[PDB]
């Protein structure tokens, strides 16, 4: 689709292998903001949102948490507290015709900027002055959308680039998209280091007689540390304690 109506796809309940994405050299831009691209196969996410569109090669910078700009203000806004990745690749053969590709369209002439992740499908005549422009376009009345030409001989900046941005839900609510890893059986009553679907730590695990309500996934402490967890694959609650330390 185009930046006028960037397509959003929710994906969940996967086993996502981000290494195949990060290893293929096809992409020109592959930049991750809240995470590290090499460390995506170890974390777990609740959901992940893939936003797809096509733009010019100039404003690939505009897809950024801040970075105010024409498209970044009027078409697609990234929240400042962004956690995710941005993928962009030139796709001139797929989207530039000898006669030119003119069906790709993007927004100008909006009354204001956009909220982060806000969609703008409104195609209404713009008002430059104060005319009550009902379907007219005379010297103050602009139709908000303008297109691209996308000639194969264009410069790099005007060529088509297909862009997809992944936004992760690192919310600790029960995860569904988890990277490729091999769950092992759990050992209790021993100071071991554990990885409960992205929740890393080190301590001694034990059965607990505290009853989670069926919707919690882990229990936390006065300090921002976990003291009880819910085991996947068993839906069982485990107490976590630090394995003993002291002075000498």
């Amino acid at each position, epitope marked *: *689709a185009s930046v006028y109506a960037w397509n959003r796809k929710r994906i969940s309940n996967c086993v996502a292998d981000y290494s195949v994405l990060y290893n293929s050299a096809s992409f020109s831009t592959f930049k991750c903001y809240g995470v590290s691209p090499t460390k995506l196969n170890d974390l777990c996410f609740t959901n992940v949102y893939a936003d797809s569109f096509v733009i010019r090669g100039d404003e690939v910078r505009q897809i950024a948490p801040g970075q105010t700009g024409k498209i970044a203000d009027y078409n697609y806004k990234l929240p400042d507290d962004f956690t995710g990745c941005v993928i962009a690749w030139n796709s001139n*053969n*797929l*989207d530039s*015709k*000898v006669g030119g*590709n003119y069906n790709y*369209l993007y927004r100008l002439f909006r009354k204001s900027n956009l909220k982060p992740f806000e969609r703008d499908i409104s195609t209404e005549i713009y008002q430059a002055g104060s005319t009550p422009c009902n379907g007219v376009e005379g010297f103050n009345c602009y139709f908000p959308l303008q297109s691209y030409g996308f000639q194969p001989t264009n410069g790099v900046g005007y060529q088509p680039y297909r862009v997809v941005v992944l936004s992760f839900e690192l919310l600790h609510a029960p995860a569904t998209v988890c990277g490729p890893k091999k769950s092992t059986n759990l050992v209790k009553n021993k100071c071991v280091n554990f990885n409960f679907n992205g929740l890393t730590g080190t301590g001694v695990l034990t059965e607990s007689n505290k009853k989670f309500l069926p919707f919690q996934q882990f229990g936390r402490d006065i300090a921002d540390t976990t003291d009880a967890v819910r085991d996947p694959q068993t839906l069982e609650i485990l107490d976590i304690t630090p394995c003993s330390f002291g002075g000498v």
Partner: antibody
Amino acid sequence: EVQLVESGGGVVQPGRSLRLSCAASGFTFSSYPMHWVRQAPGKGLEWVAVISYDGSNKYYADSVKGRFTISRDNSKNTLYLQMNSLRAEDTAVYYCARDTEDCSSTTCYVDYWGQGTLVTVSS
Amino acid sequence: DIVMTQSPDSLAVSLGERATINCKSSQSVLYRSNNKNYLAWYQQKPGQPPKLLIYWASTRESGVPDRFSGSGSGTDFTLTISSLQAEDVAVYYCHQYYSTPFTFGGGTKVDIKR
């Protein structure tokens, strides 16, 4: 106002590999994507493949995997389809077709059909 | 991919009347950046390669009288023929072009019922 004359064709034995070449006339060949559309006796239309206007991207059909390859000799205005290891179900008239670059992407609906051959599969 | 269900398949309806062929694919083969429904209606007389009737599943192309009419959206589409003539004992098809691999319809062998 396009005429397509397809070389190749005739009876073929299964397990053999050969090729068709379709010469195009009446337009600018190197700026139009090509399609192969099977017209099976009593079945109808079955899409096969597509080659980009410059021939940059190649798409093949699902049940055609492991069988065909399709190239495009723009010099003599020809589309080449090298078919391999044919089966007795693959007898049909395989019409070569010229696209119209009208859709937003580099593929769209088709307008012009050329009269393909009758590669005949039988042992 | 996008598997298409085209109904009905064996139209046997007398001359002059209306008729309608609906199409229902698994995917909603449409686009909103360009409110154009990537889908086409074709027809074929026996002995010839088929002929293009409707593009964008709604819009009429030249050389097409009102004996053909395309419409539809979402994933449901309709080819409506207002009046029948003697040259329209032919097989009708639907065809997607939203996303590869492309698919066709099952066919619709229309005849003037006698």
